[PDB]
Ligand SMILES: COc1ccc2[nH]c(C(=O)NS(C)(=O)=O)cc2c1
């Protein structure tokens with residue numbers, strides 16, 4: 001064990017440091033809560049923290065790591081916002097006791113060797129054009145789950161496909177951890193929190209509202225069925241200035257089929273200039 | 288003498304004079320007279336008007352029942368059982384002759400809004416509605432009168448009636464009562480076969496979707512509504528219009544009202560909803 005000063009933010013770099021300290025708190029009967037982030041924290045992140053925080057006797061581990069494996073190449077990796085400064089101050093403000101900030105060398109000392117192969121879900125939606133994206137995410141998440149060994153792990157529903165693949169990872173490998181999805185934190189107009197938002201000029205920031213509006217429209221249109229919930233989304237996206245829709249898709253909650261159903265999930269991906277915005281909502285199909 | 292009035296029971300008057308003497312006698316005893324005008328065939332929409340009128344401290348409730356033959360289907364004993372079961376104390380149920388003893392002589396001519404929307408098919412309908420509501424107001428002299436939001440063009444015309452003629456009555460508009468799938472209640476609903484009944488869901492769906500799309504602005508809202516109407520078979524949309532809440536031209540942002548009207552077979556349906564543009 002290295003130092004753990006309780007009630008204070010404790011920052012570890014080494015997997016073995018966070019692992020030892022984690023394992024120690026797990027005996028003293030505290031409950032290890034893990035919030036995996038790529039940093040550049042926003043209110044969405046803090047909701048995850050706060051939800052972690054509200055677990056009786058929780059000790060909250062925020063991991064901060066920009067996983068080069070879920071990226072390209074790609075274009076993604078050198079772009080991704082990096083502000084450990086703010087990130088760590090926000091965590092201190094929130095009363096988070098551990099930040100785990102590993103080096104790429106310490107996570108990947110053997111490069112990409114043993115990895116997680118996701119199911120067929122991972123080739124769809126966001127995995128369509130990014131076929132190794134989810135393998136990266138799941139490999140890093142498994143490794144964090146192994147290093148920290150939490151009781152519970154907290155993700156947003158912003159990345160809803162990731163959250164399902166994570167529930168799969170956890171079921172398929174018999175991981176002893178509860179996955180907590182946390183409803184998406186939204187701007188005042190409805191724009192889903194994202195680090196990727198900073199890269200929207202005013203004009204785009206204003207057109208961006210169209211995603212949350214289309215989806216909230218379809219969830220109310222849905223009493224009249226799937227076609228009308230879809231047509232209602234599409235109509236709003238259409239009415240909106242330089243939103244180019246990648247996809248708009250209605251699925252079941254586990255991102256399978258989508259029956260004549262009630263409960264489903266509506267997912268949109270769109271570009272505003274160069275900025276790719278994702279969003280999704282619970283939909284109950286009415287007729 | 289004042290007509291017999293038994294507190295706590297449903298006292299029915301057909302005579303305009305009788306109900307006038309009762310309400311004026313009641314106003315002086317410290318009751319606040321609330322009017323709920325209806326055309327009978329009472330549904331949950333009416334009982335919600337009633338419940339709103341009931342909850343005013345010291346309210347006495349007058350529910351008029353009167354089929355206007357001047358504005359554009361009888362169940363007298365059941366209607367009265369529903370009122371009794373709401374704890375209404377007055378039902379006013381005039382004949383045509385009692386209300387129009389001289390036929391149609393003096394009438395209310397509405398302003399130009401009576402000519403729009405629902406006044407397109409029926410050009411004289413709101414003349415008839417304003418004439419009987421003005422007369423109901425002078426007979427009963429209520430402190431407050433309660434109308435559903437269902438017929439929103441009508442409610443706006445009533446508020447204009449009241450302002451224009453310096454009527455000293457509060458107009459209260461009560462949010463539309465809907466079925467479980469959101470179909471605005473109406474007595475026409477029971478005429479729809481299962482196919483039409485199912486397609487009819489699309490008026491409310493349209494309007495709710497519009498109201499949520501509205502954060503993306505006025506055009507998104509309309510396009511949302513229309514997309515949902517376009518997904519329904521056998522729904523012939525007579526209009527779909529967004530207006531300010533007084534039914535003038537929709538202003539660039541801020542509060543508004545989305546209205547629709549449609550034919551499903553022989554049955555003409557309407558609905559409307561609050562809109563906040565940029566919300
Ligand atoms: C609770 O609501 C929200 C809203 C937006 C969110 N974005 C992210 C995120 O980017 N996570 S990561 C692991 O850094 O890629 C989480 C999240 C949660």
Ligand SMILES: COc1ccc2[nH]c(C(=O)NS(C)(=O)=O)cc2c1
Pocket residue numbers: 324325326327331332333335336434435436437461462463464471472473
């Ligand atoms: C409170 O919600 C509602 C919903 C539907 C309604 N319809 C009527 C109605 O038909 N009134 S009438 C024929 O002019 O007497 C009132 C009403 C109220």
